[PDB]
Design a protein around this ligand. Sequence first.
Ligand code: GFI
Ligand code: GFI
Lengths: 118, 296, 39, 39, 247, 50, 49, 238, 238
Amino acid sequence: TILTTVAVNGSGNNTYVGLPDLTLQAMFVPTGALTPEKQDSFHWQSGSNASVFFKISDPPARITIPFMCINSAYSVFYDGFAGFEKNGLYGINPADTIGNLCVRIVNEHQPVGFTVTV
Amino acid sequence: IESIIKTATDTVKSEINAELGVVPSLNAVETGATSNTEPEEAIQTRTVINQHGVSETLVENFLSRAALVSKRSFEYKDHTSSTARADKNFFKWTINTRSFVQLRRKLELFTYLRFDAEITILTTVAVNGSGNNTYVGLPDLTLQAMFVPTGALTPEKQDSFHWQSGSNASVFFKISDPPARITIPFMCINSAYSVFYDGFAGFEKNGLYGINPADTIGNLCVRIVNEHQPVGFTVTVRVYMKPKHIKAWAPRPPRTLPYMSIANANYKGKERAPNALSAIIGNRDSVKTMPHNIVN
Amino acid sequence: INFYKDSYAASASKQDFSQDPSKFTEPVVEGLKAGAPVL
Amino acid sequence: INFYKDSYAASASKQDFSQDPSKFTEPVVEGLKAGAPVL
Amino acid sequence: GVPTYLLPGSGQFLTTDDHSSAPALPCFNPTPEMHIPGQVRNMLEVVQVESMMEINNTESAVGMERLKVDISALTDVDQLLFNIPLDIQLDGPLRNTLVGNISRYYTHWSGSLEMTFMFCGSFMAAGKLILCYTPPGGSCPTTRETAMLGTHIVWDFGLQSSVTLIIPWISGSHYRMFNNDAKSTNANVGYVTCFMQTNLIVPSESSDTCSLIGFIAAKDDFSLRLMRDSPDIGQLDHLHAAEAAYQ
Amino acid sequence: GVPTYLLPGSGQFLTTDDHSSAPALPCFNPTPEMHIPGQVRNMLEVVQVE
Amino acid sequence: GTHIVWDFGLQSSVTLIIPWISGSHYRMFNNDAKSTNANVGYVTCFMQT
Amino acid sequence: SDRVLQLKLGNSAIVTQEAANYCCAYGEWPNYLPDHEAVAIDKPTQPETATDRFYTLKSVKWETGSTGWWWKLPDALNNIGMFGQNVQHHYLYRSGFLIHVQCNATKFHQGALLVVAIPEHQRGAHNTNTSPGFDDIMKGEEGGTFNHPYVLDDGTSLACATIFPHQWINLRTNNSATIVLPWMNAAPMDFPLRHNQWTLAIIPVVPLGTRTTSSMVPITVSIAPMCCEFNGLRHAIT
Amino acid sequence: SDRVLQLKLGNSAIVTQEAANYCCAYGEWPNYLPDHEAVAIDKPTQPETATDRFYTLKSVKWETGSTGWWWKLPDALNNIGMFGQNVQHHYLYRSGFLIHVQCNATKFHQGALLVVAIPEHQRGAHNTNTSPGFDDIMKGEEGGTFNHPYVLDDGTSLACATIFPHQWINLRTNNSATIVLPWMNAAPMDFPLRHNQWTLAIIPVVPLGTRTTSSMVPITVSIAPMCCEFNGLRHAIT
Ligand SMILES: Cc1cc(-c2noc(C(F)(F)F)n2)ccc1OCCCc1cc(C(=O)N(C)C)no1
Ligand SMILES: Cc1cc(-c2noc(C(F)(F)F)n2)ccc1OCCCc1cc(C(=O)N(C)C)no1
């Protein structure tokens, strides 16, 4: 469940004009996929990535992610190293790697600034 | 032979083999057939009951995903002193699936495709800051998307009488509503779309190459129904298409070099590998060099 | 849930598990047998 | 109410009342009897 | 009326949703279906088709030169000829293949692969090679005596021009991951190496250098999961003539 | 269509609600289950341990 | 090798079995103690705790 | 049993003693258009042996720097024999093809040719936004040559061309390749002068090589239309 | 009847006359990997008596200020006997364990050792944000010692360690502890050189004490792998 709130920036422009009803995009980027580098990146076209577009005025967006571990269960604790060399991270099972959640405001910026909390 | 496949095949345990006249590991690539060597014949295997599903690679699942196909921004304002090239509170788009590479490449994995298209239209607005860099709020505008088929007249202005849409299918939607959605049926004059067309569209010699006229769709015309406000806004319309009820034929080698145009398959390649005209795969020092060799 | 009158309005069909890979892996007139030399 | 095609979309399952605490309270090869000394 | 309440997620646009939607053209009759050869219903059928590996991905090789490996007569025994990285996610010889291209639209994979090599020397050329698959854990073997301890096939050139090396699915986990950490225990598959078994021996009138073409495909125990956008294609600007669609 | 009206509580996000929700990954096949020792189904089994 | 860990207690005695492990059916009582037809191996005793 | 083959169509026959097998594209065989799939209502003409026969095109020379060759169908046959006349006198045509590619050398020679039939081989142009012109595409009986066979002159990969119906001519193994092509089109019939259903590509993945005294090594293509039918009779257009 | 026990595996046997019982972790017994749970398709090697036997590690001395000891499996056995050789020559391994801990003293001695097998005992570091390094975790046959047994060196509690399979060696009661460990992993098999399924911890909750003439009081660990199988044969790596 993704919940979004907005507030008008008061720094210097400490004037209130109202809260815009913005559209947001949450894209699930799995392991090995490229993550967007800017708000207008062409990666947002999401040819195969699952993306959800939702509005601030809507009820919070919701989706179900299935059990996606490459094993039969997630390893809450992992007494091992993630790589075949000796410099890999300890205590994180690579089988449980999920990926990246990428969230952008679809709307182009307005003349004034806002703070968006996801 | 055709069969119903829901999971990856199981493995059967195998024993030592020493049989004159039997060489399952040898093949004849020249015939054009892929090697039929089984793991049980190459090594000694155990029994494995494979429960791995194959549904996620179904063509329907592979292609039935909403993908961006059109993105147009235009100014919503009084256009009395606008240039002739400016979108004056409306735009028209000749429908095509070749403008955004992620969907185009996946579609071009096949020669022929038959599907219905679910169309989702997403709209966003922003206050213009040029000179009038003041924010007053975002209006909840009404938009009209009209599908203009081949031979029909397209609107020439925001208040054109063509928008009355006597027979054209039009959808009126608000920015505050969830994105508008409609299904367009498979409308090709043939049994399937020609993803690639090795031919010319006309009976003369000056017709366009590589576009089958049987697959011509038409124009999508989108306008703001509201008359302009005293201040200007920038409206961005995004159109997403999701194929469904899909049938596909004759898979093809994937596109490797970057796309150059929506009108052809012209290629240039990157300046250097990977995906260069003379080197698709990135280089390594030699054929005996392991790029990511594990040492200790 | 499809209350529309036109069948093409329906949701996606993800239940066609029929396969025939031999169309692309073995499109030869004479089928090859396991173990026996191809040539 | 689940009209989704994928089973993992369903709501929670709170009807598994099976228990076996002996896995943690009595994981010994020789079961102990009531009253009789353990040792 | 019916009392109702809206759930979280109401009004959202999920690109992977599956619902009916309003037909824009009522009573439209689509063109009758016609039989067309080569129908594909599951992408796993495509990955089962052999395609050439780019083993010779070196700066000296241009165009289709990168699709063949040259072998010559040697004067020392048991010499290494070439090796093949087995990582599909990284940019290697397996990336631009049917199996590689299709798999890179997904994140997880499982099942056996098969490598087939065709010897394209003259009829008079003779030789024996050993093709080895080394499960992961150590460095890629550099000597025949070490490489031959793993899975391998000894290939004798002859009337049957092609041999198949099976790369069996040997994995601790049900699936592996196409992740950019090629040394991860969830991704590394191991190595494939090729050594001279005896030598390439040709008469004076035959070419002293002969070429092999390597092919790769997945067996019917192969499967993929977790669709993702392929990193093999991208755009930084609009394609030419795309703007003209709006004119 | 069906005449409807929205009740109080419509659109709320209750952290303890129990509903189905849209699958983000259609046709995904989870890894087959494997027997693992020490399964716990009710937390009262844990509190019974000394 | 073959061994038994012996815990001192009420039973005062432990038995180490030297199983017949031989390539040949019989061994020989020959003065060459290092002959492959005669040598039986060794028995050693270490502190366990 | 699989190395010797004789193909007989109409008044033409071909024998090879060094075949591997032959490929039936997508496991299909050519056939006439059935009633439940027909569109044109006029009675079609089916010349049979007059058109369903082997036509041999001009041979090409396999050189060291050869990049490969292609022929588009039915364009390559549109001016040959009674097939050409029927094509010129009719608005619609339909047919399969039987392709036999011939190349022989000595046991001291080496080389490998990929013989692949590409459906709808829409060509791209190199380093330009302009689409290929009519003269670039329609080469007729002489055919064309690949500018960049590595990417199949279309921005794709040669390595993945094996997804298409294909054989190989590996000089040490065989001296001929045979491919049977069914009708491959989105429509039951087509105008033969503006659309090409199939492209035959012969690409030397392994260059010709030898150390014996060199000789000209030609590659010869023979194509027999199968189950030809024509609709919409009128005056000759060509 | 429950104080005397003999364990025989392969060519090794152990007898204790002061046992309490023995613990089967989560009420399970080791077994080979079944066909309906296998993943690797190569035929596994099952050495049986060559590897399924008792290996005795180096004894440690129980002192007044001892904080406790631990050994990680299979790391501790990865260089011992044929088990070590099979581990070094194979990419995948799978096995249970039979653990026998030995510690004897006099009737004038007192002390209590908690003998617990911790599944996936991921260790934490004290007073630093840096994760434990390879050398901190992989100690091999020598094992390690607890820095802060009170929190199990992982920020948890020692008092709640009884949730794990465990026994006690209470000097007045018994002189040995026995625990049988099944395969405990999210995957059917694993790479033995990078992941440890079990950690054996021996922690002196009650310190060793006596007023009689003092003697060295060692603690000895003997571990027998059970139902070992290995897949993915290659050259030795170690
Ligand atoms: C938080 C989240 C968000 C998204 C998402 N957001 O947007 C979208 C989009 F694009 F479709 F719209 N997808 C996807 C997946 C997510 O997490 C998965 C939780 C799984 C897990 C593993 C473990 C673990 O390692 N254990 C228990 C040891 N815990 O939990
Ligand atoms: C994007 C779109 C939007 C609308 C629309 N928008 O609004 C309305 C209105 F007025 F009713 F409200 N209609 C209609 C149709 C559209 O596209 C049809 C996709 C079909 C196709 C052919 C090929 C192809 O040539 N291939 C595969 C080789 N690809 O896809």
